[PDB]
Amino acid sequence: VKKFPEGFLWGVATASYQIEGSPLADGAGMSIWHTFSHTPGNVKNGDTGDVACDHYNRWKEDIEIIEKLGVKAYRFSISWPRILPEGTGRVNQKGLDFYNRIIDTLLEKGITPFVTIYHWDLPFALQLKGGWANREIADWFAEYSRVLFENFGDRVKNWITLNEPWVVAIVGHLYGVHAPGMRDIYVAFRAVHNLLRAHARAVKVFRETVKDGKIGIVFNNGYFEPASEIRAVRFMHQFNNYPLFLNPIYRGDYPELVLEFAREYLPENYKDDMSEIQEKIDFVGLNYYSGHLVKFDPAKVSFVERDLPKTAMGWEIVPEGIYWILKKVKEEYNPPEVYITENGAAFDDVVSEDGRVHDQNRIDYLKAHIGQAWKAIQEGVPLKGYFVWSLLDNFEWAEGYSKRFGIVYVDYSTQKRIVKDSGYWYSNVVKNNGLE
Ligand SMILES: OC[C@H]1NC[C@H](O)[C@@H](O)[C@@H]1O
């Protein structure tokens, strides 16, 4: 048996645009993911977030599922454009009402809300003004955060500024694969820097407004391994993983190898912001899915395909990664608290004739990673919680509905939810506070 500490937080996680649908209901402004997915060629099968899981109407059902599974925490995000349809200025009471009902319901049912303030659905109005490229987004983000803290900070006490700011910056603004779909490296690194400045301004506002809660930030992380016998691994870790952001937050500069590669792309006087960026945070959130074999390649980095089980994303399954990254964050920055804020897998789920989804592959994946997380706890990592991505099959960004990450299956023709074997399994882990 592998039992977790008392009070350890078992959660599931979603994001607004991936599940809600009704992106323009009740006065909401367009987000950059509305406009990006309605642009031909950007998302697989022409999929959009217009309907998704219809969580906008079905929220009560979905939460009742969380309750019924005895899951203790729900990580969800708020749609900035539902709250402030032009990004700044006017506040939309019906947007506040929607999340208010969700929050109050969670608290009634004894589930701890973890709110992601930004999970990628930037108001379109602000993209017109440059979005993450514009230094002014630090103010816009502060104002938005303020509104949330003022309206919800009486009940929500666990907050996350940004989800995966590397993805926001690099995949949105260099690769052009995510909204706003840009391919400019100088824009991409100004977005990195402004994400940090916006994150830090929101923390500062938080200290002024919600004097009894906790705030952190979530990073994507891969477990990079070298193809032979190492510096490419070093760069990938410093660039793709938490150090890009944590080195500024804890040490006041970007990591060495990031500067080696990217100095020319950062603002000239970027160091002038670093003291503000060092605003103290309460926890680090790490997302982790996959491992990668890496080699130098005259980026100067390429991936090497390996044997190894893969998911439907083609991501290699390497459970020891989650242990490595947990050990590595403690070793490198020693944050007071850590959460695994996302871990999960996409498989080609089928509803069997018995009416059930026999996702033994997802159970195996989750089990292995939870065991590795447990190990890190035994070896001193202050892991306070673990969140499964995702509660529901949902809109998987540029992959559309073709990648199912849920522990609950969604039949999109009817919106029926069918708890998967992995969900039932996870429920028992939560009840038991660990593996048996
Ligand atoms: O790709 C899987 C998962 N990765 C991390 C992102 O937070 C989430 O939105 C996405 O669905």
Side-chain angles (χ1 to χ4, degrees), residues 171-294 296-299 301-314:
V171 186
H173 303 80
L174 175 50
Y175 301 167
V177 166
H178 282 183
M182 202 186 267
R183 290 196 28 82
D184 183 307
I185 199 159
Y186 289 78
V187 175
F189 278 98
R190 271 146 182 93
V192 169
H193 192 67
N194 288 328
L195 285 155
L196 280 163
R197 301 170 53 250
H199 153 83
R201 288 274 314 266
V203 182
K204 183 161 181 183
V205 176
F206 187 75
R207 306 305 180 199
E208 294 160 12
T209 56
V210 197
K211 301 176 189 164
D212 60 0
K214 280 148 191 256
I215 193 161
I217 179 162
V218 160
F219 309 111
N220 54 289
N221 303 276
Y223 182 37
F224 305 107
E225 281 175 282
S228 61
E229 71 179 69
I230 292 185
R231 164 180 253 255
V233 169
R234 289 181 66 212
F235 166 80
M236 285 307 277
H237 171 65
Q238 294 189 11
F239 176 51
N240 289 238
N241 299 345
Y242 62 78
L244 182 56
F245 302 91
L246 284 196
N247 218 77
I249 288 155
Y250 281 110
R251 301 192 192 162
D253 203 353
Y254 290 106
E256 166 198 353
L257 295 198
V258 165
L259 294 171
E260 296 210 4
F261 169 71
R263 173 61 184 106
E264 149 85 288
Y265 308 140
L266 281 163
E268 189 167 293
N269 299 131
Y270 82 80
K271 279 185 172 166
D272 292 357
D273 305 303
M274 283 287 168
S275 72
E276 296 104 306
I277 290 176
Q278 296 195 256
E279 189 69 35
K280 177 201 132 73
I281 59 168
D282 297 315
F283 69 89
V284 174
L286 301 180
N287 297 345
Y288 175 83
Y289 289 87
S290 194
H292 306 278
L293 197 70
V294 168
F296 179 91
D297 194 304
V301 167
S302 74
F303 297 105
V304 195
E305 265 205 275
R306 292 180 286 191
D307 220 3
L308 284 60
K310 293 181 191 66
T311 69
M313 299 301 290

Side-chain angles (χ1 to χ4, degrees), residues 14-15 18 75 119-120 163-164 167 178 218 220 287-289 313 315 341-342 344-346 389-390 394-397 399 403 405:
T14 59
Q18 301 185 263
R75 182 177 171 237
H119 202 125
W120 305 4
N163 184 74
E164 302 197 348
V167 177
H178 282 183
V218 160
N220 54 289
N287 297 345
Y288 175 83
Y289 289 87
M313 299 301 290
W315 298 345
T341 43
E342 295 185 23
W389 184 273
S390 181
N394 58 237
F395 172 83
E396 176 56 34
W397 306 116
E399 298 290 320
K403 307 292 184 271
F405 277 91

